[PDB]
Design an enzyme around this catalytic site. Structure first.
Site, PDB file in Angstrom:
ATOM      1  CG  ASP A  73       5.371  -0.747   0.339  1.00 39.75           C
ATOM      2  OD1 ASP A  73       4.807  -0.530   1.384  1.00 39.75           O
ATOM      3  OD2 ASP A  73       5.808   0.144  -0.238  1.00 39.75           O
TER       4      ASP A  73
ATOM      5  CG  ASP B 190       8.167  -7.994   5.137  1.00 38.43           C
ATOM      6  OD1 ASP B 190       8.988  -8.154   5.644  1.00 38.43           O
ATOM      7  OD2 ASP B 190       8.047  -9.317   6.287  1.00 38.43           O
TER       8      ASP B 190
ATOM      9  CD  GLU C 117      -4.899   3.174   4.239  1.00 39.19           C
ATOM     10  OE1 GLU C 117      -4.185   1.549   3.830  1.00 39.19           O
ATOM     11  OE2 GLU C 117      -4.614   3.297   3.414  1.00 39.19           O
TER      12      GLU C 117
HETATM   13  C1  HEM Z   1      -5.269   3.351   1.644  1.00 36.54           C
HETATM   14  C2  HEM Z   1      -3.366   2.349   1.160  1.00 36.54           C
HETATM   15  C3  HEM Z   1      -3.624   2.073   0.213  1.00 36.54           C
HETATM   16  C4  HEM Z   1      -4.968   0.800   0.116  1.00 36.54           C
HETATM   17  C5  HEM Z   1      -5.411   0.415   0.787  1.00 36.54           C
HETATM   18  C6  HEM Z   1      -2.245   1.472   0.035  1.00 36.54           C
HETATM   19  C7  HEM Z   1      -1.445   1.116  -0.445  1.00 36.54           C
HETATM   20  C8  HEM Z   1      -0.621   0.342  -1.278  1.00 36.54           C
HETATM   21  C9  HEM Z   1      -0.095  -0.961  -1.280  1.00 36.54           C
HETATM   22  C10 HEM Z   1      -0.829  -2.114  -2.132  1.00 36.54           C
HETATM   23  C11 HEM Z   1       1.144  -0.959  -2.288  1.00 36.54           C
HETATM   24  C12 HEM Z   1       2.593  -1.404  -2.859  1.00 36.54           C
HETATM   25  C13 HEM Z   1       2.533  -2.879  -3.237  1.00 36.54           C
HETATM   26  C14 HEM Z   1       2.203   0.344  -0.765  1.00 36.54           C
HETATM   27  C15 HEM Z   1       3.161   1.172  -0.933  1.00 36.54           C
HETATM   28  C16 HEM Z   1       3.174   2.132  -0.206  1.00 36.54           C
HETATM   29  N1  HEM Z   1       2.339   2.988   0.304  1.00 36.54           N
HETATM   30 FE1  HEM Z   1       0.279   3.358   0.105  1.00 36.54          FE
HETATM   31  N2  HEM Z   1      -1.385   2.369   0.710  1.00 36.54           N
HETATM   32  C17 HEM Z   1      -1.979   3.085   1.285  1.00 36.54           C
HETATM   33  C18 HEM Z   1      -2.147   4.693   2.295  1.00 36.54           C
HETATM   34  C19 HEM Z   1      -0.338   4.792   2.528  1.00 36.54           C
HETATM   35  C20 HEM Z   1      -0.359   6.346   2.885  1.00 36.54           C
HETATM   36  C21 HEM Z   1      -0.701   6.929   3.374  1.00 36.54           C
HETATM   37  C22 HEM Z   1       1.161   5.955   2.854  1.00 36.54           C
HETATM   38  C23 HEM Z   1       1.813   6.727   3.275  1.00 36.54           C
HETATM   39  C24 HEM Z   1       2.373   7.915   2.359  1.00 36.54           C
HETATM   40  C25 HEM Z   1       3.862   8.598   3.610  1.00 36.54           C
HETATM   41  O1  HEM Z   1       4.678   8.768   2.492  1.00 36.54           O
HETATM   42  O2  HEM Z   1       3.129   9.676   4.632  1.00 36.54           O
HETATM   43  C26 HEM Z   1       2.284   4.433   2.435  1.00 36.54           C
HETATM   44  C27 HEM Z   1       2.673   4.594   2.177  1.00 36.54           C
HETATM   45  C28 HEM Z   1       3.354   3.592   1.252  1.00 36.54           C
HETATM   46  C29 HEM Z   1       4.941   3.644   1.133  1.00 36.54           C
HETATM   47  C30 HEM Z   1       5.860   4.038   1.213  1.00 36.54           C
HETATM   48  C31 HEM Z   1       6.409   3.545   2.296  1.00 36.54           C
HETATM   49  C32 HEM Z   1       6.981   3.796   4.119  1.00 36.54           C
HETATM   50  O3  HEM Z   1       8.509   3.844   4.097  1.00 36.54           O
HETATM   51  O4  HEM Z   1       6.746   4.666   4.649  1.00 36.54           O
HETATM   52  C33 HEM Z   1       4.861   2.202   0.085  1.00 36.54           C
HETATM   53  C34 HEM Z   1       6.562   1.678  -0.295  1.00 36.54           C
HETATM   54  N3  HEM Z   1       0.051   3.842   2.041  1.00 36.54           N
HETATM   55  N4  HEM Z   1       0.484   1.290  -0.549  1.00 36.54           N
HETATM   56 CA   LIG Z   2      11.150  -7.419   7.143  1.00 34.41          CA
END
Ligand code: HEM
Ligand SMILES: [Ca+2]
Ligand SMILES: *[C@@H]1O[C@H](CO)[C@@H](O[C@@H]2O[C@H](CO)[C@@H](O[C@H]3O[C@H](CO)[C@@H](O)[C@H](O)[C@@H]3O)[C@H](O)[C@H]2NC(C)=O)[C@H](O)[C@H]1NC(C)=O
Ligand SMILES: *[C@@H]1O[C@H](CO)[C@@H](O[C@@H]2O[C@H](CO)[C@@H](O[C@H]3O[C@H](CO)[C@@H](O)[C@H](O)[C@@H]3O)[C@H](O)[C@H]2NC(C)=O)[C@H](O)[C@H]1NC(C)=O
Ligand SMILES: *[C@@H]1O[C@H](CO)[C@@H](O[C@@H]2O[C@H](CO)[C@@H](O)[C@H](O)[C@H]2NC(C)=O)[C@H](O)[C@H]1NC(C)=O
Ligand SMILES: *[C@@H]1O[C@H](CO)[C@@H](O[C@H]2O[C@H](CO)[C@@H](O)[C@H](O)[C@H]2NC(C)=O)[C@H](O)[C@H]1NC(C)=O
Length: 595
Positions: A108, A110, A258
């Site tokens: 995700d 990447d 994070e």
């Molecule tokens: C804490 C957070 C995680 C666990 C330790 C965690 C995990 C994931 C996994 C395993 C994902 C995919 C299979 C995944 C995808 C996306 N995340 Fe989540 N992530 C944690 C924390 C966050 C936070 C905070 C955000 C920001 C959300 C926002 O909209 O402000 C977050 C985002 C995302 C995200 C969006 C990509 C983008 O373009 O910003 C995923 C696709 N993660 N996370």
């Molecule tokens: Ca890439």
């Protein structure tokens, strides 16, 4: 066929058309459309955007305005009533390791990244949203529903700022709002090398013509490398523990810190780079600085694609794999490699796999210390635990020995992510990833749950009794209906994550369809997909087919006991073998006889 959208910010290039190496910015991958796929461009739209004023204001921004007749329920209320749960027992995925959730985040991260607007770091606009919750311009706060416990403790809301968009920055352009992707859409390990030429270069050693990436100097891990600290002085990693002041890490991607387990995964990648470049040097003593760097990078890039498509999607998409991603047949220049806006929300299915705690195990794969199992919430932006307490070996061991959380209809997102999430900009450990995800759907303008079931050619429920059937659940279907008043308004996130799982997968009909298509595209449209004739040599490919996360673990740490299938759930010591019994990456075919 590449030009109009908006000349935009995007930094201009000149293509080499003959270079066997990917560009850092992703440009020039497609010879007809140069920029198709390049970073800092607009996310792709598979369906028209759905905004309140049909141009840029989200659904829920103007109270008195409905969606299809009804009022969208507060994100936080959906969170409270449908998402959260209390009992953390019997909630683990019996046949998936903690690495399963961990690799998904790597992927995700990447593929996509829609950063927040900014336009503030001096400004009092970064506080008029925190303190008073006054909606306006780029602050679209998440209000608290009546009877929410956080009302008595945190305030009347949670700050939230709309994402950046793609022509300007500040106000606007005439047309329909499109969010930005600050990274490249090709599975090219961009999280390791950066996406801008500038960052890309700061990450490099350029003192020695060995082609190595720069590693930390203030601290070591048993002679092994650590990522470099970050120069920026307001640092959240120092904040969480002002006594050990350790700053965050500096790596190709900004979210690299994070959570402790994500940085750990990042560190294993920085290492195999240097490692891969020290060896290549041996082989070809005449190869210079740039040559080593590029060639190593090319390898690690093929690595990530392999692990992902061969080991990771098959147990995510389950039995719906071959229906969406048929066997590879070569490059196709007629395929949009660009990540779509909805993918970034569909892929968030992982959020319900993050378990409540993280462990550290010593060599016998046993409890490492007295406080070995720490709550997930005390690890966000935590680097001191790594650097000043154990190294990364203990954490990697956990990733293999422990399990992932299993999406359960009666138990969705951990309370560690739903109530105590830490945000880089603020201070308290009190945000809700569920409400943020939901609020962000609307921010990005995603269309309703049905528009997508339709997109994927699935039945579209209009009645309570109908929603019961699709979700195969009454209570859920009822709660979902009491809040949304029409299946037409279920936010794709909570909507997609509510359908029961497909045979041998970990997501259902509507997510499998959305992830399936996407991954098919980045592969079919990448001029440098490892199996694409010409990128690597017939003999080189044969050597890459053997890579395995397990080996990555062996050549890069001091672990000597690892499973053969690092993704399914294995138990120690049975499922664990000795490193010396694991295939290696034979770099022999990367030698060059001048004569
Ligand atoms: C804490 C957070 C995680 C666990 C330790 C965690 C995990 C994931 C996994 C395993 C994902 C995919 C299979 C995944 C995808 C996306 N995340 Fe989540 N992530 C944690 C924390 C966050 C936070 C905070 C955000 C920001 C959300 C926002 O909209 O402000 C977050 C985002 C995302 C995200 C969006 C990509 C983008 O373009 O910003 C995923 C696709 N993660 N996370
Ligand atoms: Ca890439
Ligand atoms: C836990 O999940 C494991 C991964 O799905 C699973 O083992 C895998 O089972 C599948 C069959 O369902 C098999 O996978 C591969 O088998 C053929 C070879 O016959 C390959 O050509 C295909 O690509 C296919 O993916 C394997 O038998 C196995 N795969 C791996 C990598 O181990 C376990 O059965 C699950 N455990 C439990 C208790 O359910
Ligand atoms: C902030 O990070 C600190 C790390 O610098 C951490 O304190 C360190 O960790 C513990 C404190 O509980 C101490 O380790 C143990 O040392 C010996 C064993 O070798 C024991 O006798 C002690 O009782 C102790 O358990 C470290 O000495 C300590 N180091 C320093 C400089 O304080 C803090 O716990 C962190 N604080 C928070 C709020 O997270
Ligand atoms: C850049 O690469 C050089 C060359 O390897 C590194 O120099 C080594 O530094 C370590 C500790 O500082 C010692 O092993 C030696 O002093 C050097 N080894 C050799 C073979 O010269 C240098 O540390 C790297 N710089 C960064 C920031 O990573
Ligand atoms: C190259 O990729 C394109 C991208 O889709 C393929 O397009 C085919 O399927 C599309 C729908 O999925 C349709 O838009 C087109 O009808 C169809 N394209 C053609 C030329 O028939 C295309 O098949 C791929 N090319 C090859 C040779 O496989």
């Amino acid at each position: 066929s590449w030009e109009v959208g908006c000349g935009a910010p995007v930094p201009l290039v000149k293509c080499d058309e003959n270079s066997p190496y990917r560009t850092i910015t992703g440009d020039c991958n497609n010879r007809r459309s140069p920029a198709l796929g390049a970073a800092n461009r607009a996310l792709a739209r598979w369906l028209p955007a759905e905004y309140e004023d049909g141009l840029a204001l989200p659904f829920g921004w103007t109270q008195r305005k409905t969606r299809n007749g009804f009022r969208v329920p507060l994100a936080r209320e959906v969170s409270n009533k449908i998402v959260g749960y209390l009992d953390e027992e019997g909630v683990l995925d019996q046949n998936r390791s903690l690495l399963f959730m961990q690799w998904g985040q790597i992927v995700d991260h990447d593929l996509d990244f829609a950063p927040e607007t900014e336009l503030g770091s001096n400004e009092h606009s970064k506080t008029q949203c925190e303190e008073y919750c006054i909606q306006g311009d780029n602050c679209f706060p998440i209000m608290f529903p009546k009877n929410d416990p956080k009302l008595k403790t945190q305030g009347k809301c949670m700050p939230f700022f709309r994402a950046g968009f793609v022509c300007p920055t500040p106000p606007y352009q005439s047309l329909a709002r499109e969010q930005i992707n600050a990274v490249t859409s090709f599975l090219d390990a961009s999280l390791v090398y950066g996406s801008e030429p500038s960052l890309a270069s700061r990450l490099r050693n350029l003192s020695s013509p060995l082609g190595l990436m720069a590693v930390n100097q203030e601290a070591w891990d048993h002679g092994l490398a650590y990522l470099p600290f970050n120069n920026k002085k307001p640092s959240p990693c120092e904040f969480i523990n002002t006594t050990a002041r350790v700053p965050c890490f500096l790596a190709g991607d900004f979210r690299a810190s994070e959570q402790i387990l994500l940085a750990t995964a990042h560190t294993l990648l920085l290492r195999e780079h240097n490692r891969l470049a020290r060896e290549l040097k041996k082989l070809n003593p005449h190869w210079n600085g740039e040559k080593l760097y590029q060639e190593a990078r090319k390898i690690l890039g093929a690595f990530i694609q392999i692990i992902t498509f061969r080991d990771y999607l098959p147990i995510v998409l389950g039995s719906e794999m071959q229906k969406w991603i048929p066997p590879y047949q070569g490059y196709n220049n007629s395929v949009d490699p660009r990540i779509s806006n909805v993918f970034t929300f569909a892929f968030r299915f992982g959020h319900m796999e993050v378990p409540s705690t993280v462990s550290r195990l010593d060599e016998n794969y046993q409890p490492w210390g007295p406080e070995a199992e720490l709550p997930l919430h005390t690890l966000f932006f935590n680097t001191w635990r790594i650097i000043k307490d154990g190294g990364i070996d203990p954490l990697v061991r956990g990733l293999l020995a422990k399990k992932s959380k299993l999406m359960n209809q009666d138990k969705m997102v951990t309370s560690e992510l739903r109530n105590k999430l830490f945000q880089p900009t603020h201070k308290i450990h009190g945000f809700d990833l569920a409400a943020i995800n939901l609020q962000r759907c609307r921010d990005h303008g995603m269309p309703g749950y049905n528009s997508w079931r339709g997109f994927c050619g699935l039945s579209q429920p209009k009645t309570l009794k109908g929603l019961q059937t699709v979700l195969k659940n009454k209570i859920l279907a009822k709660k979902l209906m009491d809040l949304y008043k029409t299946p037409d308004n279920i936010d794709i996130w909570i909507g997609g994550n509510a359908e029961p799982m497909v045979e041998r997968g970990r997501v259902g009909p509507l997510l499998a369809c959305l992830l399936g298509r996407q991954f098919q595209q980045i592969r079919d449209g990448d001029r440098f997909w490892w199996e694409n004739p010409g990128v690597f040599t017939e003999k080189q490919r044969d050597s890459l087919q053997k890579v395995s996360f397990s080996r990555l673990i062996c050549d890069n740490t001091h672990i000597t006991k690892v499973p053969l299938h690092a993704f399914q759930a294995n138990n120690y010591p049975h499922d664990f073998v000795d490193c010396s019994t694991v295939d290696k990456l034979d770099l022999s075919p990367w030698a060059s006889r001048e004569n």
